[PDB]
Amino acid sequence: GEDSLGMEVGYRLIPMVDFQQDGELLGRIRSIRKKFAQDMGFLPPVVHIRDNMDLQPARYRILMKGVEIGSGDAYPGRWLAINPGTAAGTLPGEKTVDPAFGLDAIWIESALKEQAQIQGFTVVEASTVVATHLNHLIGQFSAELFGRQEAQQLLDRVSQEMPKLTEDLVPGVVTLTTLHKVLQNLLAEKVPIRDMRTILETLAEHAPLQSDPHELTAVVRVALGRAITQQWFPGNEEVQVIGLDTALERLLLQALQGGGGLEPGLADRLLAQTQEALSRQEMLGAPPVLLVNHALRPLLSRFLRRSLPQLVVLSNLELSDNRHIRMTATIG
């Protein structure tokens, strides 16, 4: 009954979503959905747009299965001047916060656009503010948006290109339930699922031996290690990562191996130090990537990303073996 993905708008935002008028936001939505399909392998559901007149005139909401996941203001006659961290001074206008990243921002008249840019502000128009927020929410909720129906539709599409591979695999070797869970686990850590041949071929080799979607996910991630490596370290420059202090690594390994647990305070400090390492990577311009021993990757991914979803936790078995790695930050 409820649309998988929906948007509600006050009356001032109707033009940017009206195919008979300017409809600028409709074209941005299409590019967002196309870019997710091509880059992540995940065609998001259509965004059902409807007017809502008890909403403020310049207000929009974004909803998933009828549950609001985001909202904000967009003023068609104004630009949003966003301070990325380097802007200088202030501008007159409605002070706010950019909906995607939480950065300080100001809605400004058109006549201040260039002045704001000279002051180092990133200046975007109203429809782009909404699009950016939607694009961010689709990314944040990619796994939740990829339900069983979505998994079936994708399997049906790939079946057209790879009929024999898909026939030998589902449902006799891996069920849709298991395939959906593995694909969801990949999307949950921002791993693209566009390379369905490698994914299905890997499941075909290991599903007969391991029915656990958790273990399949680890083996699929290794099979996709080149795509994962190029996602966070595109090109051929030095791979700059966070690493664990050597002593910490062994304390965690021996805790999972029944050799003695770590005091709870050490876990809290582990989390605090991961946040500090993230801030350092950001300051260095390096990726938000923590590289760890294969045996630790699922644990630390779940433990740390619960509080720090921006963190990427990779296994040493996933990182392309021809890359030069440098630990630019150390946790512990």
Numbering used by the authors: 359 to 690
From the publication, what sentences describe this entry?
Type III secretion systems (T3SSs) are membrane-embedded nanomachines that export dedicated proteins from the bacterial cytoplasm. FliD and FliC are found in complex with their dedicated chaperones FliT and FliS, respectively, in the cytoplasm. Here we report the structures of the ternary complexes among the FliD and FliC flagellar proteins, their cognate chaperones FliT and FliS, and the export gate protein FlhAC. FlhAC folds in a clamp-like structure with four discrete subdomains (d1 through d4).
